[PDB]
Amino acid sequence: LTDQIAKNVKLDDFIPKRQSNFELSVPLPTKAEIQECTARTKSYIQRLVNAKLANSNNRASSRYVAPANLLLNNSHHIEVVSKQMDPLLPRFVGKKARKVVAPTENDEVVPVLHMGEADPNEW
Amino acid sequence: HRPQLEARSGAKAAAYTPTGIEHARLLPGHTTLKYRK
Amino acid sequence: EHPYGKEVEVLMETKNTQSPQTPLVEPVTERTKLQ
Amino acid sequence: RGGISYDQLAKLSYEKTLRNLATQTQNSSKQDKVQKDTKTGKITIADDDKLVNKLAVSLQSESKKRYEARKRQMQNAKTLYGVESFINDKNKQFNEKLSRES
Amino acid sequence: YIGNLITRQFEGRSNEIVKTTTKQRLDAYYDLELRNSVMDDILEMMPESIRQKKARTILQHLSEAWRCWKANIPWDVPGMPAPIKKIIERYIKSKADAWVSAAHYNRERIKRGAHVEKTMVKKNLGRLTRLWIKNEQERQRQIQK
Amino acid sequence: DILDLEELREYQRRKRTEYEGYLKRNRLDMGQWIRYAQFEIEQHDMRRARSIFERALLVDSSFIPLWIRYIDAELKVKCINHARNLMNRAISTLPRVDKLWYKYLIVEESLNNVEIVRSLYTKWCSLEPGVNAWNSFVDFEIRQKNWNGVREIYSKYVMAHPQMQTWLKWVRFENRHGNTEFTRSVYSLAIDTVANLQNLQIWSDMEVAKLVNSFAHWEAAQQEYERSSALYQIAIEKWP
Amino acid sequence: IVNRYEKLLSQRPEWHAPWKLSRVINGHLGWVRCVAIDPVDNEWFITGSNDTTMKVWDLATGKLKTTLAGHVMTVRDVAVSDRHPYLFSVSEDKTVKCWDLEKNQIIRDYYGHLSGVRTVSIHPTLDLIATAGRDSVIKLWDMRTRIPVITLVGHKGPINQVQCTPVDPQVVSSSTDATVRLWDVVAGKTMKVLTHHKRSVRATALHPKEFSVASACTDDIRSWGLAEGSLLTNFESEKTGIINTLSINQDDVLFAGGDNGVLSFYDYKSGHKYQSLATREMVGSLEGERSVLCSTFDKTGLRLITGEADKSIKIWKQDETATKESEPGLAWNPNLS
Amino acid sequence: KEMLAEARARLLNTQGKKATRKIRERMLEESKRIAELQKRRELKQAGINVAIKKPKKKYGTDIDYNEDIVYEQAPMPGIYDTSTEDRQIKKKFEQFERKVNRKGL
Amino acid sequence: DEINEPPPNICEQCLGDEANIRMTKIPQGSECKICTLPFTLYHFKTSKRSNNIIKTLICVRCATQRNICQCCMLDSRWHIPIQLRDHLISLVNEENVMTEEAKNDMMKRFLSLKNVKLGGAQIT
RNA sequence: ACGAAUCUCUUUGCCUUUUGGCUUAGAUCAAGUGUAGUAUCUG
RNA sequence: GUAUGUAUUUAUUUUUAGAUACUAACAC
Ligand SMILES: [Zn+2]
Ligand SMILES: [Zn+2]
């Protein structure tokens, strides 16, 4: 049953790896590996920024910027189409400032793992 | 009923819905970066 | 001075060299503009 | 002389409850498993209803005793020291903390 | 403008509203950063346990040491762990230097006589009289020694 | 006081609005959380109490009294399995805090189940906590039998705390139980490990002195002056 | 477990040379909170201050080039850019100001922190900024459009120190809840948590090569491998507390600035401490004012620059005599932990 | 003796203008509660049953803590699979409320 | 991004016998009938010429948690009212699996954000 | 004879209802005055 | 020549003189 009890925490997390052999080499992350993370991250951030600059109230700010649905078994397919808003009416009919308390969903526990008498008379 | 004892976590403000008011200082300015050699 | 006294240069700086307008990073002009 | 770190203290309390428990066992002598489903990993452990009630009663009892003793120190604490001037109870208590600081 | 007026009229005003530091609320923020910065240190020197009681207490000792620094009173606590006294002496020396430098700066701004607020004149006067008396007491003590 | 149901119902609403007011304003001040959960217990409603506690932990999990009262809230209402799951959460959060492990141990032994405490202490040993834990663990086995086991336990223990008084406890066990055969062999097992690794220098000289005197002196108690003086004599050679 | 202790006695680590004091520069009115160095030419410093200014010192002679004002309160952090001619400064006034090194004037202001912002780090390849402070969140700013693109919710307290890395975890952060998180920004959630510190982690530094980080606390300076997120090593430290800053030379020397004024140099590989110094306070200072607020090495790594709480910058040079005659430091005795 | 009595009066009170006011205002509120309660008891003695009122809503999103679990944080999942103890609990709880409807605490 | 990315959940029933369908997507529509938070809305018409118009009421989250259809609000598989399927399931076992729901506001506004997946849903 | 338990009291340990911010100490400083509503003290 | 705050449920949910007084947008 020993497996179940403190199942998460385990010894080898407390012990440092380089103390066995110094000079055990942690490689810096090559080159063509960073040219990847840089690519995907760059694209993602562009998606956020362009996603924002087309939101807000400036016909000015937009100059600095697919059926796609197989529903269920795809039987009925679909075609998805945006609707042009009456420019006067509010775009985003449902955007309204409201405050929300989010829950904190804790799936697992992160063990907090660390390694007076006369002292109080000092402190 | 006085002083801070804490600060406000930005986490809270992260979950709210945006208003979309347009401020004066976020109007586009210095719109082009500069790269070194 | 004496707190260090030998090798150490104790220098007290006020005012400025390099009048404030100077670029502090030189703009690279690739072409030479005669205009 | 002295303070005690929160570890040694923890050990001492553990020992204390061990002694108390062993006395319940001896006096009880004087008066006279693990199954885990395949479907879910939920473990189940057979229990005696006795000793569980005895446990709850032990916890409640000790809480009562602590609460009472502290309460008596409440009573004596305020009735002992009438020397200096005080506006309210809380003042007197604060100044007794000043007596502890000496 | 009217964009903001109406989008605020349908969608309500923003709940976040962070608010910047300006001429009026500056000193408050300076206080605040300071008391926090002392909390960190004096929590990290201590060996283990106690926080909130000793928090409020130690920060009170800060305030009292500041007042006693304005009044030129030496501020010894009859007993107190030395390292904490090192720390509080440090931060109060810091705040002192900032305060003095603000007094000089505002004075030499008034000598030119350019847009000083009605109160800043009064306050600045106060800081200068404090400083002047400190110079006086210094001169007298140094004459005794 | 309260009369009918709808009377009580308000008495809940009001108190709760006061509480969650003061907790709305102060996320900290755990006293208030503890008293509030305590209230929802005195209303015989557990679910609410548990929610209150869980929140109080999401705020701060490093304040143990909160943990302990949240355990005893489940025990006192005779809900055990909850007080188990809660424990594997607790110690797994804070494996260094001793009070947690000891508490879970006691709660297990008051239920007489000795296998769970056995595997428990095993795990609590694997993390190499310190002398108090191990000592409490052999003092566990003494309440049991495991005279075969307690040897293995001391084995692990002396490998994880290579100091004299650990070995001195080891032999003091046998001599307390008087068995001579193993005693001699183990006294041998200490000294040759000393001189074997002694170049590694961790054992202090005075330590060596106290260890020699124990084995030689005890052999003198066994009337093996030949053997005793033999040992002591080798010790002269191996040392300045 | 003794087997580990033997395996600590085989290595006999990594000789280095001691350090000494080359130069003292007065000239700030308040404390010196932060220091950064021109990443290309090594021609200068930018030093924050507690007087709100920033004074650009020449590295060669130590003379003062220019002064950059513009913040109303103390400047906790300063960071200069590689690819750009930009300087991002950040303060307790809730604001992150860009600076165009060409014309020496504020270009942009980034807005949106709730309170004082104690750290800026400039992502190497993305044209981002990472800022953090008592908000308890890390804000990833788009450098061009001043839009706080991503926000990283996480630590349960203030955030002291933040770093950026080109591959995974692209942001490393350290907070007063005594943790260090390794972030995955695209998904926007913690990739790994490192809890091993017992108190506020007040300083970190990235090794310029090995792709690891050195984290600090009161008495214990650990190291951490990135990628996997393993522990790598520990560093031998009796009470040095409090560790205000760390800096890693290209030679695998790990500096540790004290609040007791002690300069504790380490080898990075081993964990050994080969030197400890004590600074001289100053002519009229207090014994309390002797401490080390920040520090860095030049691009070479043969000079060290430490702002101190005595209102002075000190420049520590590595001795050229040294070798084995008498360098030897404390000489590698691994006490039991 | 007059100014001494007055001195004795001022030195013993630290309540303050706002604090004294909140004490007395709280007394007023509790009095109002007592009044409404005994109203309901008297009307009950005549058989007419009237429910208590919720004190409106200060602001739009205001919460009534009685009506629902405020923020329900599940304790966790866990290996020991309680699932029985919950039954005994609910039995004890419904027992409690089923008592209050009669003996009335 | 977060709101768009999950695709809609629609029954095959109410979506009609037409082979290919044109549906409109509004990036902020009404709030849920449930959680009271914004989301993305979808028109469509069963027939091309049918006068009646179908409008997804609830979120994707507030649906997925309950495992129902956004237009119908019937169970995604059995085409059953939520208040029923949990009664059938509750018939097996004994007493459980009732879906407890969210009075006040930020009770519900809160609740929709957790990943729980609901009492009723888990069996289906 | 000592081991063990309950109750009571005293001493040590733990602190229990035991001072929660900044600015020019944040600034200032009395018989003060007439009449009037209402409380109540004495023959 | 007081902000501000609380409450405003009507239409019926199944079983003998005055002294010491407090105060007053009321009279320098
Ligand atoms: Zn919804
Ligand atoms: Zn449908």
Curated annotation (Swiss-Prot), chain B:
Q: Which subcellular locations apply to this protein?
A: Nucleus
User: Segment Disordered: which positions?
Assistant: 1-16
Superkingdom: Eukaryota
Q: What does this protein do?
A: Involved in pre-mRNA splicing.
Family membership: Belongs to the CWC15 family.
Please describe the quaternary structure of this protein: Belongs to the CWC complex (or CEF1-associated complex), a spliceosome sub-complex reminiscent of a late-stage spliceosome composed of the U2, U5 and U6 snRNAs and at least BUD13, BRR2, CDC40, CEF1, CLF1, CUS1, CWC2, CWC15, CWC21, CWC22, CWC23, CWC24, CWC25, CWC27, ECM2, HSH155, IST3, ISY1, LEA1, MSL1, NTC20, PRP8, PRP9, PRP11, PRP19, PRP21, PRP22, PRP45, PRP46, SLU7, SMB1, SMD1, SMD2, SMD3, SMX2, SMX3, SNT309, SNU114, SPP2, SYF1, SYF2, RSE1 and YJU2.
Q: How is this protein named in the record?
A: Pre-mRNA-splicing factor CWC15
Which species is listed as the source? Answer: Saccharomyces cerevisiae (strain ATCC 204508 / S288c)
**Gene name per UniProt:** CWC15
UniProtKB/Swiss-Prot annotation, chain E:
Q: Where in the cell is it found?
A: Nucleus
Per the record, the domain of life is: Eukaryota
Q: What function is annotated for this protein? A: Functions as a scaffold that mediates the ordered assembly of spliceosomal proteins and snRNAs. Required for association of BRR2 with the spliceosomal U5 snRNP, and the subsequent assembly of the U4/U6-U5 tri-snRNP complex. Functions as a scaffold that positions spliceosomal U2, U5 and U6 snRNAs at splice sites on pre-mRNA substrates, so that splicing can occur. Interacts with both the 5' and the 3' splice site, as well as the branch region. Has a role in branch site-3' splice site selection. Associates with the branch site-3' splice 3'-exon region. Also has a role in cell cycle.
What other remark does the UniProt record contain for this protein?
A: Present with 468 molecules/cell in log phase SD medium.
Domain free text? The MPN (JAB/Mov34) domain has structural similarity with deubiquitinating enzymes, but lacks the residues that would bind the catalytic metal ion. Contains a region with structural similarity to reverse transcriptase, presenting the classical thumb, fingers and palm architecture, but lacks enzyme activity, since the essential metal-binding residues are not conserved.
What is the name attached to this protein's record? Pre-mRNA-splicing factor 8
Q: Which organism is it from?
A: Saccharomyces cerevisiae (strain ATCC 204508 / S288c) (Baker's yeast)
Organism lineage: Eukaryota, Fungi, Dikarya, Ascomycota, Saccharomycotina
Span of the full-length protein shown? 725 to 869 of 2413
Curated annotation (Swiss-Prot), chain G:
Similarity comment: family membership = Belongs to the WD repeat PRL1/PRL2 family.
Positions annotated as WD repeat = 27-58, 70-100, 112-142, 154-184, 196-225, 238-267, 287-317
| Quaternary state and interactors | Belongs to the CWC complex (or CEF1-associated complex), a spliceosome subcomplex composed of the U2, U5 and U6 snRNAs and at least BUD13, BUD31, BRR2, CDC40, CEF1, CLF1, CUS1, CWC2, CWC15, CWC21, CWC22, CWC23, CWC24, CWC25, CWC27, ECM2, HSH155, IST3, ISY1, LEA1, MSL1, NTC20, PRP8, PRP9, PRP11, PRP19, PRP21, PRP22, PRP45, PRP46, SLU7, SMB1, SMD1, SMD2, SMD3, SMX2, SMX3, SNT309, SNU114, SPP2, SYF1, SYF2, RSE1 and YJU2. Interacts with CEF1, CLF1, NTC20, PRP45 and SYF1.
Gene Ontology biological-process entries: mRNA splicing, via spliceosome
- Record keyword Lyase present: no
Its annotated compartments are:
Cytoplasm; Nucleus
Any additional notes? Answer: Present with 1770 molecules/cell in log phase SD medium.
Q: What does this protein do?
A: Involved in pre-mRNA splicing. May also be required for cell cycle progression at G2/M.
Keyword annotations: Cytoplasm, mRNA processing, mRNA splicing, Nucleus, Repeat, Spliceosome, WD repeat
Q: Which residues of the full protein are shown?
A: 111 to 447 of 451
- What GO CC annotations are associated with the protein? catalytic step 2 spliceosome; cytoplasm; Prp19 complex; spliceosomal complex
Query: What is the protein's given name?
Result: Pre-mRNA-splicing factor PRP46
Q: Does the keyword Nucleus apply?
A: yes
The source's domain of life comes to Eukaryota
Curated annotation (Swiss-Prot), chain I:
User: What role does it play?
Assistant: Involved in pre-mRNA splicing. Facilitates the cooperative formation of U2/U6 helix II in association with stem II in the spliceosome. Binds to RNA.
* The protein's assembly and partners: Belongs to the CWC complex (or CEF1-associated complex), a spliceosome subcomplex composed of the U2, U5 and U6 snRNAs and at least BUD13, BUD31, BRR2, CDC40, CEF1, CLF1, CUS1, CWC2, CWC15, CWC21, CWC22, CWC23, CWC24, CWC25, CWC27, ECM2, HSH155, IST3, ISY1, LEA1, MSL1, NTC20, PRP8, PRP9, PRP11, PRP19, PRP21, PRP22, PRP45, PRP46, SLU7, SMB1, SMD1, SMD2, SMD3, SMX2, SMX3, SNT309, SNU114, SPP2, SYF1, SYF2, RSE1 and YJU2. Interacts with SLU7.
Q: Which domain of life is it from?
A: Eukaryota
Q: What else is known?
A: Present with 4260 molecules/cell in log phase SD medium.
Regarding protein family, the annotation reads: Belongs to the SLT11 family.
What is the phylogenetic placement of the source species in the record?
Eukaryota, Fungi, Dikarya, Ascomycota, Saccharomycotina
Which ranges form a coiled coil?
Answer: none
Compartment(s) of residence? Nucleus
This protein's species is Saccharomyces cerevisiae (strain ATCC 204508 / S288c)
- Whole-protein residues included: 3 to 126 of 364
The identity of this protein, by name, is Pre-mRNA-splicing factor SLT11
